[PDB]
């Protein structure tokens, strides 16, 4: 969608204390999951970046 | 007047009664507005 | 958990036998039920809803006082290692689950009456071997001791660490905002009462903070202007009924932690406590913490009745001794109001009015109690209210030191 999230994150900086942009809960890997589960492992990489 | 101490007696203090011996009819009480959250409303629970 | 406790039975005020009749036992601990967590079953939000104004048990503290006297006649196993009978009634089992009349075939030995009996858990090995089920005894015995040690008000302990509050306690307190003191005291009593717990438990720290906050607000150091991590207590208007307090959370400036850890023992020096729910609840709540964690140190004998002088495992005069402070509510209220004016919460005109109202309110309590005593002379064989003298209402006690402690406690 024209990478709306990226611009929203930048815009939120000027309005912190009124709106806080947060990482989606579903973006996180399952807690019970293990590091060996490759799809979960990738998520942390994106989550970190 | 004995049954209405909290309405006519000047010396009536809040929080008194004659319960074991007499039943008054005009006293002071409390009222509440409790709410009843469900389990999910209490804790962070979502799907896996 | 905590596998040991020490205790002390009540004192007879010159009378030759413990002060309670059969009906007292039959009502307060009958029905073959467990008596070990009943202390709050006959308390409520305020005096207005309670029968404390007449007939038997004509005071807020009356029932619990009688309970303490009642236990003094049956705690022999922790004194002599054996179960006994008194006036035909004894425990049903070695677990001390409940009371019943003695059996006709093999009665236990009759208890020899005595007063101010020291108590050790080690005297009765089966208790530890069944700690998981006999745990409630620990709390009540502790409570009984903490009251028996003092004339006038019961004794309780205060302390504040140098650290900030942990997050868990913060979340818990944020759920108890609009709750009156009485309900809070119940939960504290309920928590420590029914199953063993380690002192390193979240609730233990939680209640410890509550007792601290309660006292700090009682002295008036903690207000809407100045608060402990955002929390403080609010007291009702003296013009109507000052015997009520609720928890609050606020934007006010937060007090800094003390330079070093503070702690002391407390008691009310004046008879007003016997008919004032905030005193009873506050004491019980604080006593609950010590019940699960034990006494941090021996109590100073310097300002205690004669029978409390040098009680083993409880009182001392040596180096490792914590002083005990005391106060009278009326001077305390004046100090609290004065602090409010200095904080700018009220004007001088209001402060004068508040003192007049509170003094008038206190006068009624004294007038009620003193009339109630002559209605129930202790020679009658049961003590619904602790004896006192008229001059006892006028004692200032160590009130000046008390507010000084809160001054240092919440800098």
Can you spell out the DSSP letters for C175-197?
TSTT-BHHHHHHHHHHHHHSS--
Contact B48 A25 (CB under 8 A): no
Token pair belonging to B1:
């007047």
8 Å CB contact between C325 and C398: yes
* Residue C405: strand, helix, or coil: helix
- CA distances to B38, C74, C249, C252, C359 from C233, in Å: 29, 39, 8, 13, 21
B24 CB neighbours in chain C (<8 A) are: none
Token pair belonging to C9:
């039975």
8 Å CB contact between C264 and C205: no
Distance from C-alpha of B19 to C-alpha of C48, rounded to nearest angstrom? 9
Method: cryo-EM
8 Å CB contact between C207 and C323: no
Quickly tell me which residue has 């407390």 as its tokens: C266
Q: Is A30 near chain B, with CB under 8 Å?
A: yes
CA distance B46 to chain A (A): 10
Of B14, B20, B30, which has the smallest distance from its Cβ to C54's Cβ?
B20
Resolution (A): 3.3
Distance from C-alpha of C93 to C-alpha of C319, rounded to nearest angstrom? 43
Strands lying side by side in the sheet with C315-316: C315-316, C298-300, C321-322
8 Å CB contact between C142 and C7: yes
Of B21, B27, B30, which has the smallest distance from its Cβ to C55's Cβ?
B21
Contact A32 B46 (CB under 8 A): no
- Residue C235 pairs with which residues in a beta bridge? C245
Distance from C-alpha of C381 to C-alpha of C220, rounded to nearest angstrom? 41
Torsion-angle region of residue C81: left (phi > 0), alpha (psi -120 to 50) or beta?
A: left
8 Å CB contact between C77 and C124: yes
A30 CB neighbours in chain B (<8 A) are: 48
Contact C55 B27 (CB under 8 A): no
Sign of the torsion formed by the C-alpha atoms of C36, C37, C41 and C46 = positive
CA distance B20 to chain C (A): 6
Q: Is B29 near chain A, with CB under 8 Å?
A: no
C50 CB neighbours in chain B (<8 A) are: 17, 19
Q: Which residue of C lies nearest to B6 if distances are taken between CA atoms?
A: C48
8 Å CB contact between C315 and C298: yes
Helix-helix angle C348-375:C329-342, to 10 degrees: 170
Q: Which chains touch A (3 or more CB pairs under 8 A)?
A: B
Q: Which residue of B lies nearest to A32 if distances are taken between CA atoms?
A: B48
Q: Which residue of B lies nearest to C57 if distances are taken between CA atoms?
A: B20
Contact B29 C55 (CB under 8 A): no
8 Å CB contact between C219 and C235: no
Distance from C-alpha of C176 to C-alpha of C370, rounded to nearest angstrom? 37
B48 CB neighbours in chain A (<8 A) are: 30, 32
A32 CB neighbours in chain B (<8 A) are: 48
Task: Print burial letters for C277-298: b (CB count within 10 Å at least 16), e (below 16).
Answer: bbbbbbbbbbbbbbbbbebeeb
Sign of the torsion formed by the C-alpha atoms of C297, C299, C302 and C303 = positive
Distance from C-alpha of C278 to C-alpha of B15, rounded to nearest angstrom? 14
C243 CB neighbours in chain B (<8 A) are: 15
Maximum C-alpha span of chain B: 67
- CA distances to C23, C67, C100, C102, C377 from C26, in Å: 5, 11, 10, 15, 21
8 Å CB contact between C158 and C86: no
């Amino acid at each position: 969608n024209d990478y709306a999230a990226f611009w929203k994150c930048i815009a939120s900086w000027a309005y912190n204390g009124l709106v806080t942009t947060v990482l989606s809960e579903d973006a996180f890997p399952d807690s019970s999951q293990s590091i060996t589960h490759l799809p979960s492992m990738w998520k942390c990489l994106f989550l970190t970046l | 007047p004995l049954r209405w101490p909290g309405l006519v007696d000047p010396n009536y203090r809040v929080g008194t009664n004659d319960l074991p011996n007499r039943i008054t009819l005009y006293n002071s009480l409390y009222r509440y507005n409790f709410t009843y959250p469900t389990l999910d409303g209490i804790m962070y629970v979502r799907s896996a | 958990a905590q596998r040991q406790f020490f205790g002390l039975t009540y004192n007879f005020y010159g009378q030759p036998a413990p002060l309670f009749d059969l009906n007292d036992l039959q009502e307060l601990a009958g029905c073959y039920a467990r008596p070990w967590t009943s202390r709050f079953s006959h308390l409520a939000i305020s005096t207005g809803s309670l029968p404390v104004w007449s007939a038997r048990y004509p005071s807020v503290a009356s029932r619990n006082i009688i309970v303490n006297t009642l236990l003094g006649a049956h705690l022999n196993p922790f004194a002599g290692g054996q179960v006994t009978s008194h006036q035909g009634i004894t425990w049903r089992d070695p677990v001390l689950s409940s009371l019943a009349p003695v059996p006709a075939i093999q009665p236990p030995p009759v208890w020899a009456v005595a007063e101010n009996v020291p108590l050790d858990s080690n005297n009765y090995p089966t208790y530890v071997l069944n700690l998981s089920s006999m745990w409630p005894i620990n709390q009540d015995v502790h409570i009984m001791t903490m009251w028996a040690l003092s004339d006038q008000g019961p004794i309780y302990h205060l302390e504040v660490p140098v650290d900030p509050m942990p997050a868990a306690t913060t979340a818990a307190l944020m759920a108890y905002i609009g709750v009156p003191i009485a309900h809070l005291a119940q939960t504290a009593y309920r928590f420590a009462g029914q199953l063993p717990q380690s002192p390193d438990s979240t609730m233990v720290s939680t209640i410890r903070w509550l007792s601290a906050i309660w006292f700090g607000s009682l002295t008036g150091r903690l207000n809407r202007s100045r608060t402990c991590n955002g929390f403080y207590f609010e007291f009702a208007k003296p013009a109507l009924n000052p015997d009520q307090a609720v928890l609050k959370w606020n934007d006010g400036a937060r007090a800094a932690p003390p330079a070093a850890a503070q702690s002391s023992y407390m008691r009310c020096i004046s008879p007003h406590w016997q008919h004032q729910i905030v005193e009873v609840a506050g004491a019980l709540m604080s006593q609950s913490v010590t019940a699960v964690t034990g006494l941090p140190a021996l109590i100073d004998e310097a300002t205690l009745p004669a029978w409390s002088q040098g009680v083993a495992n409880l009182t001392g005069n040596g180096q490792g001794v914590v002083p005990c402070l005391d106060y009278n509510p009326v001077p305390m209220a004046a100090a609290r109001h004065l602090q409010w004016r200095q904080d700018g919460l009220i004007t001088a005109a209001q402060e004068a009015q508040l003192n007049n109202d509170y003094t008038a309110y206190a006068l009624t309590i004294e007038r009620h109690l003193t009339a109630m005593l002559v209605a129930n002379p202790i020679a009658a064989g049961r003590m619904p209210i602790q004896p006192f003298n008229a001059a006892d209402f006028g004692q200032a006690g160590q009130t000046a030191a008390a507010v000084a402690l809160a001054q240092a406690m919440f800098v």
